[PDB]
Amino acid sequence: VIVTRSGAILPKPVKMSFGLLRVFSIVIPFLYVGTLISKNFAALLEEHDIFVPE
Amino acid sequence: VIVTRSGAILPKPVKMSFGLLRVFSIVIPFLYVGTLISKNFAALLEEHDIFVPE
Amino acid sequence: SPDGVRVAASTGIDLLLLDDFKLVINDLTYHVRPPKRDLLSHENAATLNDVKTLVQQLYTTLCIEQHQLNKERELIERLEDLKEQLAPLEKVRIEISRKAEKRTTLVLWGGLAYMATQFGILARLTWWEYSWDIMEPVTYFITYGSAMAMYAYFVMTRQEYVYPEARDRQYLLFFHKGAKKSRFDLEKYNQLKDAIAQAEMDLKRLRDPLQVHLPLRQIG
Amino acid sequence: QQLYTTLCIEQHQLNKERELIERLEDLKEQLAPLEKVRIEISRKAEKRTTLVLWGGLAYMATQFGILARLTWWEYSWDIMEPVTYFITYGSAMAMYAYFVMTRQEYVYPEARDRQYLLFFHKGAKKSRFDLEKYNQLKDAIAQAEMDLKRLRDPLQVHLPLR
Amino acid sequence: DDVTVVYQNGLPVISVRLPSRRERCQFTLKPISDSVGVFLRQLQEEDRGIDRVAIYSPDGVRVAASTGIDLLLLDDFKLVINDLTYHVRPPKRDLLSHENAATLNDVKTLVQQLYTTLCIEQHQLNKERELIERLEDLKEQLAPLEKVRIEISRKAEKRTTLVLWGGLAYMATQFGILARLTWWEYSWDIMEPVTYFITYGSAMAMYAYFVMTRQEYVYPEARDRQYLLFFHKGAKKSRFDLEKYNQLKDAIAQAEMDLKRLRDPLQVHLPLR
Amino acid sequence: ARDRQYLLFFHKGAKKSRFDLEKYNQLKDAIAQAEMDLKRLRDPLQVHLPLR
Ligand SMILES: CCCCCCCCCCCCCCCCCC(=O)OC[C@H](COP(=O)([O-])OCC(O)COP(=O)([O-])OC[C@@H](COC(=O)CCCCCCCCCCCCCCCCC)OC(=O)CCCCCCCCCCCCCCCCC)OC(=O)CCCCCCCCCCCCCCCCC
Ligand SMILES: CCCCCCCCCCCCCCCCCC(=O)OC[C@H](COP(=O)([O-])OCC(O)COP(=O)([O-])OC[C@@H](COC(=O)CCCCCCCCCCCCCCCCC)OC(=O)CCCCCCCCCCCCCCCCC)OC(=O)CCCCCCCCCCCCCCCCC
Ligand SMILES: CCCCCCCCCCCCCCCCC[C@@H](O)O[C@H](CO[C@H](O)CCCCCCCCCCCCCCC)COP(=O)(O)OCC[N+](C)(C)C
Ligand SMILES: CCCCCCCCCCCCCCCCC[C@@H](O)O[C@H](CO[C@H](O)CCCCCCCCCCCCCCC)COP(=O)(O)OCC[N+](C)(C)C
Ligand SMILES: CCCCCCCCCCCCCCCCC[C@@H](O)O[C@H](CO[C@H](O)CCCCCCCCCCCCCCC)COP(=O)(O)OCC[N+](C)(C)C
Ligand SMILES: [Ca+2]
Ligand SMILES: [Ca+2]
């Protein structure tokens, strides 16, 4: 809805200050540690001869 | 719902004029330029010896 | 005040006659002594309040139908003045809500154009150049990235990502910059739009005691 | 009309609205100590709700990183595809267990409000806040304002226009 | 010819063909805050090829230049421009202001309200005395029925609880079956189409639920629907009449609503609604 | 979507039969208004009718 019960226009939607930078500063350095965790876990499980595919 | 708080009938819902041809005249040529973008990008990536399917 | 200080202008009269005061006319100072109104009975005054509130209800019905005709014509005159004061601003308001709706249909058609070109990218690259076994995880992470962006929309806007609410939000964000670029005051238009609804809600609250002679309903 | 004058009814009506205005502005006198505590509690409850919102976003990014490393670097997609199906089905099980346990569906702007109310009602008991007196004052002010708005109704003749 | 005016959202406009310019000039008007002389003053501002302008009556007598246009636009009239007399017939309205002269019905409703406000307190107190007895009678008439309705609404709750946890146990056994098949016995190259067709069968069953029950399949509505089905099937095998219980509860609420609607006017001396 | 398809079927049938829908709608609102102000005249609290 874009109006009230009268014809008066609704107020401006409250944007968040630096919203896109606040999302991309919390996605990227957690995606990096999510890469590092899985890399170290795969290497630690491979080195002890438990799961090797090839 | 279909009726008001009394027994009256809600009015006819508005219809976009020639809706399916307006959707299909913007679905088809963007699909075609998507195939063109992907074909030229894969040809460029194969021609510079980066990712060649083998 | 009798110690020498001056009494201010908008001091109530009931506060004034508690103690003495001095009234100064051009050259003369009179020393007024107000009496003490010690007739405060607690008993035989909860029976004076009911008669005093019955006389008010008897006077009200004698003077209520000639009052709600003066108020009716004053409401009609204020309504037809507010409409002529609003009518220059209306043609300016419509031409801001026409650019703000064309910029919203460009977003609504470019979402469909983006989905159709992503379909054409994956359908070209799956059957022609690379196989489906190569191009399956790309589609899966496209799906998971969309399921992550739909949550980032909620984390940034405090509003769930559905289609018409996001369309209305984007429309209002377009309107509140179109109405800022073109030097348009939204506050006077909103107070000229709520005053009309307030003045014509009371006009239909007067339908009861003037058309069918029933007692009118309260505010709320 | 000769009883409306000798009983002094107009000053009685203005005395009545003066009593209503004084009761309204004395109900707002014992509220201003309480909102200084309530604003503090609501602020340090929203500051904890945004923590779990950003934590959920960081968790989804971490799961993206974990499932993106193995399908291309270490293993193949033929190993990690059933794992990433069963993660999806486990999420679909957890969103139903939320409904069985919480008696409401799992959507974002209602889970946020419920979590905010749980944080607020933990903090209001931790700070020994007197919530019931606050709710009684917030009801009584909203009733006294409605009574005052009905007393000075312009379509009635309850008070003289002077 | 200007045989008519045009109505635009409650305001009139006269399309008067001007004398010395061959055009149908529009003229919007405020009916309440304008007179005839204002309209003749601003009609001749347009061309000044006007040597005579006068608004007449249908009978032929002149209309004064101080009567308002709302009093003019009640009936039809004539507008005499300097050679031709345009008969104007505006569209008929119902009412704008409910104002006219005095009537015997007005004084007969005045003594009606003067009779009402002398006896409405001694009638409202005699009605509140009836209400405070009627409410306690209804609330003690209901005391055998609530003891039975609680025992029915506890059986229906303890059955829908088992339906909820049984659905959770089903979607947790399907996980175990599929996770046993894809890793121990068979492989994912066998069990991927069964996974897809189970997902599509669930998406088909959620639409068949909508076709049968005429409502969408969401969780807290599909819980309450099955709860009401358990309640109405359980209250029929216990000889419990809901048509008495429902009319007792709504009658209690109506008496309480009328009590709270009259008791506060006894406090603050305002009208009721 | 079911209710929108129902309204698009009903408003086509009402143009085929020439049903005069707006007289129906204004009568259906007018009898609700006449029952509302009749029910506010038979009030048990307001003494509007004698012998009661
Ligand atoms: C630097 C290092 C590396 C870089 C990494 C990535 C960088 C990418 C950059 C992306 C950023 C976008 C930039 C936009 C910023 C400015 C936006 C703006 O001003 O827009 C004005 C306009 C109105 O502005 P306004 O009135 O001021 O209002 C401001 C906001 O709208 C007010 O909004 P609000 O407050 O109401 O809330 C809305 C909010 C809602 O927030 C969101 O929705 C945020 C969503 C993102 C969250 C994070 C997603 C997680 C993704 C995971 C990443 C995985 C990485 C892969 C790695 C894996 C392996 C390890 O924010 C927005 O919607 C902002 C709009 C931007 C959309 C962002 C979408 C980009 C997604 C990209 C993700 C990553 C890409 C993967 C790359 C893959 C590589 C192969 O805003 C719009 O919404 C309009 C949309 C238009 C968008 C672009 C239009 C393009 C059109 C081109 C022309 C077409 C021509 C046709 C040709 C014809 C041929 C036939
Ligand atoms: C020549 C052709 C002709 C053929 C015709 C022959 C057809 C057979 C005729 C059968 C008719 C017999 C009537 C039976 C009466 C049953 C009444 C009853 O149970 O009393 C309950 C009674 C309550 O009675 P009531 O008061 O009348 O209320 C009942 C309703 O509320 C009623 O009102 P409502 O308004 O709530 O209505 C909602 C309604 C409607 O809502 C629905 O859910 C509709 C479902 C229909 C959708 C159909 C989906 C299509 C699937 C695709 C086909 C796959 C084929 C693949 C072939 C590929 C080859 C190329 O739900 C139900 O009533 C049904 C309950 C659950 C049914 C779920 C069954 C669907 C799955 C069947 C697929 C079979 C897969 C086999 C694969 C085998 C592989 C080796 O007490 C209860 O305990 C309450 C029920 C508790 C909740 C549900 C409990 C589930 C019970 C059995 C489930 C077993 C485990 C689940 C396994 C999942 C499958 C994977
Ligand atoms: C200056 C003026 C600019 C004009 C030109 C602008 C051109 C912009 C081009 C991009 C258009 C904006 C895209 C908006 C639509 C995206 C399409 C998206 O909605 O489709 C989804 C695909 O998702 C996308 O892949 C990810 C996009 C996530 C949206 C992030 C918000 C970005 C838009 C912010 C502006 C809001 C505009 C809203 C327009 C509808 C469907 O996936 P699905 O899962 O099946 O649907 C789930 C059902 N839900 C939505 C009810 C839950
Ligand atoms: C307190 C100190 C700070 C703690 C900081 C650490 C935070 C840890 C992270 C906790 C997570 C809580 C937030 C949950 C975010 C998960 C987002 C969820 O949507 O992801 C889904 C994946 O599911 C998740 O794995 C779990 C599902 C949720 C079940 C657990 C509920 C946890 C709620 C706990 C209360 C907290 C309030 C919730 C905040 C939003 C994938 O999305 P999708 O599949 O497309 O859902 C469809 C969209 N619907 C729901 C609107 C229809
Ligand atoms: C005598 C006492 C009686 C005892 C009877 C015991 C019976 C035990 C078994 C009962 C089975 C009930 C099943 C409950 C539903 C299972 C959970 C369901 O949600 O799984 C879905 C898959 O299941 C299928 O959809 C089947 C459901 C179709 C309807 C089945 C019949 C329901 C009749 C009973 C209704 C009351 C159920 C209680 C609420 C769940 C997953 O869908 P998903 O994609 O992941 O998320 C979609 C989210 N939506 C729904 C909001 C959009
Ligand atoms: Ca898949
Ligand atoms: Ca394969």
Author numbering:
A (entry chain E), B (entry chain F): 48 to 101
C (entry chain C): 129 to 348
D (entry chain D): 184 to 345
E (entry chain B): 73 to 345
F (entry chain A): 294 to 345
What did the original publication write about this model?
The Ca2+ influx is mediated by MCU, driven by membrane potential and using a uniporter mechanism. Patch-clamp analysis of MCU currents demonstrated that MCU is a channel with exceptionally high Ca2+ selectivity. The MCU subunit comprises three structural domains: the transmembrane domain (TMD), the coiled-coil domain (CCD), and the N-terminal domain (NTD). The TMD of MCU is known to be responsible for Ca2+ selectivity and conduction, and each MCU subunit contributes two transmembrane helices to the TMD: TM1 and TM2.
The NTD is connected to the CC1 via the linking helix α1, and the four α1 helices of each MCU subunits stably interact with each other, forming a four-helix bundle that stabilizes the MCU tetramers. In our structure, four EMREs, four CDLs, four horizontal PCs, and four vertical PCs form a cage and bundle up the four MCU subunits. The N-terminal (48–65) and C-terminal (97–107) residues of EMRE appear as loops, while its middle residues (66–96) adopt the configuration of a single α-helix. This α-helix locates within the membrane and is tilted by 37° relative to the normal vector of membrane, such that each EMRE subunit interacts with two neighboring MCU subunits. In the MEMMS structure, one CDL and one horizontal PC molecules insert into the gap between TM1 and TM2 of each MCU subunit, and another vertical PC molecule stands alongside each TM2. Notably, most of the lipid chains of the CDL and vertical PC in our structure are parallel to the helices of TMD, while the lipid chains of the horizontal PC are positioned horizontally in the membrane. In addition to interacting with TM1, TM2, and CC2 of one MCU subunit, each CDL molecule also interacts tightly with the neighboring EMRE. Similarly, P60A mutation in EMRE, just next to the MCU-R297, can also totally abolish MCU activity, proving that the correct interactions between CC2 and EMRE are important to MEMMS.
